[PDB]
Ligand binder design. Sequence first.
Ligand SMILES: CNC(=O)c1ccc2c(c1)OCCc1cc(C(=O)N(C)c3ccc(C(=O)N4CCN(C)CC4)cc3Cl)sc1-2
Length: 841
Amino acid sequence: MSEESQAFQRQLTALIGYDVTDVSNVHDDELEFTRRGLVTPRMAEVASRDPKLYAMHPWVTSKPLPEYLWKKIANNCIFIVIHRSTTSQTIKVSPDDTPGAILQSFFTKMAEQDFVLRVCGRDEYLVGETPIKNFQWVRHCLKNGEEIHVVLDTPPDPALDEVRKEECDRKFRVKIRGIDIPVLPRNTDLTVFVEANIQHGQQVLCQRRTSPKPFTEEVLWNVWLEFSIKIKDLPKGALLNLQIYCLLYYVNLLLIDHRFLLRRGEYVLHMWQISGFNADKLTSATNPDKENSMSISILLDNHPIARAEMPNQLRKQLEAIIATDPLNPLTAEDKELLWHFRYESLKHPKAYPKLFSSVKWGQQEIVAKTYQLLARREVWDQSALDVGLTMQLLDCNFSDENVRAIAVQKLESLEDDDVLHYLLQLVQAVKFEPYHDSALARFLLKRGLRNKRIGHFLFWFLRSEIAQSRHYQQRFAVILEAYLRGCGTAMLHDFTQQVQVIEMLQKVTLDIKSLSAEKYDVSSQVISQLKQKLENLQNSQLPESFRVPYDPGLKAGALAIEKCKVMASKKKPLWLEFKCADPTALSNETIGIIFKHGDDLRQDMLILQILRIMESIWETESLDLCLLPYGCISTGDKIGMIEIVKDATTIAKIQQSTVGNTGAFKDEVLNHWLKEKSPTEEKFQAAVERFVYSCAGYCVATFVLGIGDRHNDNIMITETGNLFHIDFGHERVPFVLTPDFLFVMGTSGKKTSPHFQKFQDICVKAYLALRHHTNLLIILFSMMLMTGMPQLTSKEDIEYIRDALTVGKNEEDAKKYFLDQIEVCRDKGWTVQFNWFLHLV
Ligand SMILES: CNC(=O)c1ccc2c(c1)OCCc1cc(C(=O)N(C)c3ccc(C(=O)N4CCN(C)CC4)cc3Cl)sc1-2
């Protein structure tokens, strides 16, 4: 291994934020085995991808143009403005024209074909055989009433993407020797025992306990725990879960390894301490902190794997069971039905999750029958892809490799555009895979390496987790490294720039947070030191440019130091502004970015991404709710970026600017603000309309997600009328619809009006459009809770969304339910809003 290659691994380590060659925290070779296992999938995708299309990463969709976007084209014509160093002719185009085609109606229309169309000021290309109406940038421009400005230039050199070459029928038992912790002192000395569980898909096959003993820094049982399950019956993917109760600590050990071998020998496992149900509890990783953590010693001394028509009424029971929601509990009666009627069940793709939860995974013969069942998979294979269904089979309830692979098989058919929609949840779903190398992980690897946009986000989503999750960083690092080894030198250089930038801003963030207290109010002293420090960075270890992490097509240049500052809030986040490093840009507007330290931005990414999913869901229904899921990215431990939405203010600041002593609240302020920021009544009417739509979308989305009761300071609005929520980091009301919002709607004092009627109509339409996707929403909600929050009750917390989506009810009762919800806010008026500030005194 050349000295060059060692320097390279060093490079990857700094981009990843973890050393994948570190062997300090392992008890076997799973991780190394996986690094090697992933080489094949990587080389295969690299060798398979088209260098040209890969370099230009066109962003496209096969989906039809929504009704609400056809509205803006009734002339069957679209205008593209091409530019080239001086003047710019505006070509009239047909929505079906191909980029190379409009290049024919150009060159000849003017009068060598080795040129390509690129969006002005962006690293975005319109290429490939695709109708221009199928390009996302084109649809984004129409939806925003913006013109499509493009520049004619030379295709990027694929050479820049060069990738560096690479080079027994006995019952199961376990001996618990004892436990050891360096320091126990809490308050009162209690007693302690060890609980050993054998689990599969968060289902206990057998449970055993040790006798209680005095809790001292060292407790030695030296006791055999014999389980009812036979060795031969252990399913691959089963975990020996070990727990200490006084519940204090846990740790897991895969009973059958990545080689299909039964675990054997001595183990000293360092455990995880509970913070006083979630994905972290399922991890096969052990606590890396060997100095301050509890450990448990165990011994293993115990390779494997070597007609009749249904009556009308049972079938009805069966179909009823299948119709129930993902969260409906399956009775013992229900499971037996599903299993007995196995072959009938297999004819309904929607039964798959319920059927595989009916499997007795602790019985070799049954599992086998199950694999036999999966053999004739025709009905499933030809079924239309249902993302909600697929994700159900990737959650914590399925530990079987084969069950999860068919889920992954269905994902193979997603277009890149959809992958981007679900990417974050798919990455989080890697936490439910029992092995490091899995079909799900390889699919993400493959898709990321196939498309630059997916690779970029895949990188940040992985790095965010590597940086702040001890439970999963090892697995995610191996995945990221594999990816980094195939993305190409260009991407590598880009990621390097981005990582350098955020690292510098982190330093700065910290140093500046130090030069001030815990809030007040800053301090011209504090702002000046910031500007100096940035001036220092600017010249230079701070790279010429870098891609915006939440908007990779955008290249950020030099900081505009005069415009930077520290925001006035408890935490002291930076308000940074940069110049665009692309001369071809259509404006002088800077790139605003908020850099913040002290908060875990992962919950916000999760919420913002779900918001994006709701928008695409609504698109599948021809609806546009005008949400504004601003860019947000966890870039490392307790740090990240947030997009600064231009021309936007807080609803509270608007209130506050007019008196606002102790937080008095006037109904007409909002309407006045909008009218004053409008240059004309036209623009004002557009603002009001957009407000109605945006208000409706956020009321619905926020109710469903159970995040509806918010303080005014957590909700913003653009000067153009777009309302939107922010800060999703962790009497009552379902959502925020205050009298001022109502005032803009032309209503006041519980009355009606054309815009308000229009609002209720949009809400209801929005609400029921989401109910057609109930299962997708429920499964995303529950995964989000398991992988993104603290230790959430696996029933009651998750059950909220079921109630919220009013599962089980017909359309009439649903509309009713929501309309009453709208009434509650009205009756409550300003109460909850009003309650703030006082709680603090
Ligand atoms: C011209 N644009 C803006 O002023 C602006 C302000 C805030 C945001 C923005 C634009 O983009 C939209 C997304 C966004 C998201 C935010 C967020 O998540 N949090 C937690 C947040 C809330 C308040 C502040 C804050 O201190 N201030 C200073 C007072 N000012 C009136 C509001 C923002 C900072 C953050 Cl990061 S702030 C914010």
